[PDB]
Amino acid sequence: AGSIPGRRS
Amino acid sequence: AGSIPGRRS
Amino acid sequence: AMGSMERASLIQKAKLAEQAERYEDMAAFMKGAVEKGEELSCEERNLLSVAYKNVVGGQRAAWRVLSSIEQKSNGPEVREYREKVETELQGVCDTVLGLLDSHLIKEAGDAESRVFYLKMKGDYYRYLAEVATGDDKKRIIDSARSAYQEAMDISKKEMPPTNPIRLGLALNFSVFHYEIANSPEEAISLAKTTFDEAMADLHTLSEDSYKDSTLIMQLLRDNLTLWT
Amino acid sequence: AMGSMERASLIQKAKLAEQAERYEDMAAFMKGAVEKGEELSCEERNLLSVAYKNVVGGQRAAWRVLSSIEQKSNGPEVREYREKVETELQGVCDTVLGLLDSHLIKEAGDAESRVFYLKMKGDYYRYLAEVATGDDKKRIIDSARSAYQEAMDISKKEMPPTNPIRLGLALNFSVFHYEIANSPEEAISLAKTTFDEAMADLHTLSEDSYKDSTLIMQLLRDNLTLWT
Numbered sequence A, B: 001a002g003s004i005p006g007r008r009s
Numbered sequence C, D: 001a002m003g004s005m006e007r008a009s010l011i012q013k014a015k016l017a018e019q020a021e022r023y024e025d026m027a028a029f030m031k032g033a034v035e036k037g038e039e040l041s042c043e044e045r046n047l048l049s050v051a052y053k054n055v056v057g058g059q060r061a062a063w064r065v066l067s068s069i070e071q072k073s074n075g076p077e078v079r080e081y082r083e084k085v086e087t088e089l090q091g092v093c094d095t096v097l098g099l100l101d102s103h104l105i106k107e108a109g110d111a112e113s114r115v116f117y118l119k120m121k122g123d124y125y126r127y128l129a130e131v132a133t134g135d136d137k138k139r140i141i142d143s144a145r146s147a148y149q150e151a152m153d154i155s156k157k158e159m160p161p162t163n164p165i166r167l168g169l170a171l172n173f174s175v176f177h178y179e180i181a182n183s184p185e186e187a188i189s190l191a192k193t194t195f196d197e198a199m200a201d202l203h204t205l206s207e208d209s210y211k212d213s214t215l216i217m218q219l220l221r222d223n224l225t226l227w228t
């Protein structure tokens, strides 16, 4: 089950 | 040009 | 630590650290920028969130590796090392929560910034809950729930159903329900309702906004496929 | 830092840190193990080398990203941050070199251990040379060369031409020649002679040793393909 990766920005 | 990766052991 | 560096230099260095994949540096630069005391722009909020998600993401992945070895093992070394990684992870989560509490949330008056920070608050309590054991787990779980719920209430009143922050909040709160709160049916209901309400609002979007919203909708769909 | 932890616990934790991809921890555990003052076994030497190669490999990749941005830019932030990463990299290389000099090399009497440590010494001077600028570059380059040459002289006298450490030493010294010493013809000659002499000795090897030697031979071939 995946949360927002949110690792790039 | 590659040296020995040497990152796993 | 970063008190002598200009705010704008800290922001610039956080962007460089991201390019160099130096996420610990990036988090330290963004912590320094927050501690200047000014509100963060949309771009700066994203830099703060990306930095810490990478730092804590590496810690969580390591904690899971060590927890798995330790479970299989049942000397003190595996537990000791898992504990060290766990304490470090808790320290980073406490640092982020401290930034949100002093004083990012209270100064966030627009819905976009307030929802963003409350989603962060829910996420970092959720990461604390992943490693918590017992009744401490209960209060940490309730703190995550409360933060996500407040964010949800604002987002439903103030943002369209396709807003990417609204969508990512709903995604992460659904994961909270499934993985932390042992409420898989609530997780599935939230992901389905969120997906369907976004679908119905896609017609209002430009090409670029459509791409942004449908990317996160696909994440909701991926979870629903796994859960149903 | 690690003076109160048992040697065997440091070794065990270094293996766990590798599994968890916590290479800074792994390097700190292995530094602590070296500082116990005993010689390292073959496995322990490999843990030490893997830990530091990962740490410095991340620093080198970041330094290259920042150096590229800085070259393109020609405020102070890019240079300042490149300098910070560079100083950190130099500090890690100096730490490894200090372990080799106090006292791993002088206590290494068997060819396998002495060649291993001298190859490390050449590699870490080579990493210093990558970031050095001017006449400092000259003396650092000579230190790398001298370490590699001593390792080469021992390896040719004491190990078969298929020995993986002998092969990896020759590979890395060839990269030194090509990338650092501006001697591409010496790089190509060394890689070719090393490959050919190994090929001629493969018939003496078991299946498992054959796999070990041919893997590194392929790296020599990959460089020759790029250089010729």
Ligand SMILES: *Cc1ccc(S(=O)(=O)N2CCN(CCOC)CC2)cc1
Pocket: A004, A006, A009, C042, C043, C046, C119, C164, C165, C167, C168, C169, C212, C216
């Ligand atoms: C928690 C969360 C929700 C949505 C995203 S995102 O769609 O990947 N995205 C939102 C903002 N956006 C633009 C900012 O300019 C830098 C970047 C990321 C991510 C996390």
Ligand SMILES: *Cc1ccc(S(=O)(=O)N2CCN(CCOC)CC2)cc1
Pocket: B004, B006, B009, D042, D043, D046, D119, D164, D165, D167, D168, D169, D212, D216
């Ligand atoms: C510098 C160098 C030369 C060769 C290698 S390797 O072939 O990948 N290899 C040698 C020793 N070996 C066995 C040790 O047991 C853990 C592991 C790696 C690597 C670097």
Ligand SMILES: [Ca+2]
Pocket: C006, C007
């Ligand atoms: Ca200022």
Ligand SMILES: [Ca+2]
Pocket: D006, D007
């Ligand atoms: Ca002891």
Ligand SMILES: [Cl-]
Pocket: C039, C107, C108, C109, C110
């Ligand atoms: Cl405000």
Ligand SMILES: [Cl-]
Pocket: D039, D107, D108, D109, D110
């Ligand atoms: Cl000895």
